[PDB]
Amino acid sequence: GSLVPRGSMQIFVKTLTGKTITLEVEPSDTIENVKAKIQDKEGIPPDQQRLIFAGKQLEDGRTLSEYNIQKESTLHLVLRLRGYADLREDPDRQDHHPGSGAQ
């Protein structure tokens, strides 16, 4: 059971049962996008997923830069883990940008 990340982001996450899932971290990366990383590990829904930082749980969904919070260290956010990962058929899309280059 091993898969390769897309954003090359790795973090430490501990579930209630003890399971561990790799999550992405960044100043401009909020739980909104992070949900795509954790979803590939177990597939836990961010809508119900709980965010626990420094033992304190939260709910709001903002960036570390805007919320000035420390999530690029140790964060554990998992709701009723299950255990389901893979290398194929995972939550990941293309990070391309628009063109619009006329003469």
Planar angle of CA 21, 22, 28, nearest 5 degrees: 130
Count of domains in the chain?
A: 1
> Distance between CA 80 and CA 17 in Å, rounded?
8
Cα 95 to Cα 30, 34, 60, 82: the distances in Å are 16, 14, 25, 29
Within a 13 Å sphere around the CA of 23, how many CA atoms are in the beta-carbon half?
A: 31
| Residue 20: CATH number of its domain | 3.10.20.90
Give the position of tokens 């883990």. 81
Q: What's the domain range around 98?
A: 1-103
Give the pair of three-digit tokens for residue 45.
């829904």
Give the position of tokens 């290398």. 87
> Distance between CA 14 and CA 20 in Å, rounded?
5
Could you count the other beta carbons within 10 Å of the beta carbon of residue 76? 19
